[PDB]
Write a protein that binds this ligand. Structure first.
Ligand SMILES: CC(C)(COP(=O)(O)OP(=O)(O)OC[C@H]1O[C@@H](n2cnc3c(N)ncnc32)[C@H](O)[C@@H]1OP(=O)(O)O)[C@H](O)C(=O)NCCC(=O)NCCS
Length: 281
């Protein structure tokens, strides 16, 4: 004997837990992998939030100090979400994403019995190899025009009330309040109608949007648009959500297929109009 390596061998690469010192690299991987033409700071702030939500959730793949690939797992009580998968285009299609995902699953299986995600066209085939099954599509729409229609009765609140925690638990099927909180530390606005619905507005995005009726969801969405919301990701199985957004003359941006490994989570998707993020569920 001679050389002593205390990790599995995988193509001469190093895969390890990310820390906040790795934010710039994560951002670079993401912008490469997703061909993101937007401003950098946008991604940096999003990833700072992700590491607050799950400090030990991010795996990074390195080929000799060059950052090549990443992915994340976010834990709730009954399920975890895998999101933010990305391998730099020069390094794609040689098994790196598959390996990062394997490792994430390994971590997830010890803690929870259901793992879910929102799959793009490139990812879909990877996740299917691990026996992920289709749930329903989650469709990203851009809201183009302001409806000529006033609303009254929607307020922004600085602390999450218990009734919001309860209606979100019902919509999502789990506890993700720490995610809402992390976004609100960065300026995200919590809009509430009556005690029957809420929406979270962060940058140009509303998510989640949860409402006991289409009329309450509409009130929130109109006020969100006024506060700069231009995008919403709708679960395609909420029949009222697609009809709701039509008054904004929406433009479809992209869709994913939500997928699951393990047992179905009881969720109330009829009240669930806008998912939080493809990364988080
Ligand atoms: C999904 C992604 C992370 C895959 O990473 P990767 O290192 O290239 O994937 P792997 O080499 O391990 O390939 C695993 C499987 O992914 C799927 N895949 C990867 N790239 C693909 C693409 N270009 N088109 C269709 N399927 C693709 C295939 O099923 C592949 O298996 P195969 O080679 O036997 O057919 C992806 O290429 C990426 O970083 N893009 C980012 C944005 C995106 O569209 N996907 C992430 C969100 S779900």
């Amino acid at each position: 004997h001679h050389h002593h390596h205390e990790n599995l061998y995988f193509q001469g690469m190093i895969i390890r837990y990310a820390t906040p010192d790795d934010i710039e690299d994560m951002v670079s991987i993401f912008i490469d992998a997703y061909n993101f033409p937007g401003p950098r700071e946008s991604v940096k702030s999003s990833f700072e939030i992700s590491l607050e939500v799950q400090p030990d959730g991010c795996l990074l793949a390195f080929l000799k100090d060059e950052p090549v690939g990443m992915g994340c797992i976010f834990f709730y009580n009954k399920q975890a979400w895998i999101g933010l998968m990305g391998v730099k285009k020069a390094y794609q299609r040689r098994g790196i994403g598959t390996e990062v995902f394997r490792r994430l699953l390994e971590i997830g299986r010890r803690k929870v019995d259901t793992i879910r995600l929102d799959a793009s066209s490139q990812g879909y085939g990877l996740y299917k190899k691990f026996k992920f099954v289709d749930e329903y599509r989650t469709v990203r729409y851009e809201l183009m025009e302001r409806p000529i229609k006033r609303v009254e009765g929607v307020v922004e609140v600085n602390k999450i009330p218990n009734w919001v925690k309860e209606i979100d638990k019902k919509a999502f099927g789990d506890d993700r309040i720490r995610v809402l909180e992390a976004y609100m530390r960065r300026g995200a606005r919590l809009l509430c109608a009556e005690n029957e619905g809420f929406g979270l507005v962060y940058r140009g995005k509303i998510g989640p949007l949860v409402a006991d009726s289409p009329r309450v969801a509409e009130k929130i969405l109109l006020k969100a648009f006024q506060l700069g919301a231009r995008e919403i990701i709708i679960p395609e199985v909420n029949k009222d959500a697609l009809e709701l957004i039509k008054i904004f003359k929406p433009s479809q941006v992209t869709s994913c297929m939500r997928m699951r490994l393990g047992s179905k989570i009881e969720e109330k998707v009829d009240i669930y109009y806008g998912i939080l993020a493809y990364a988080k569920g």
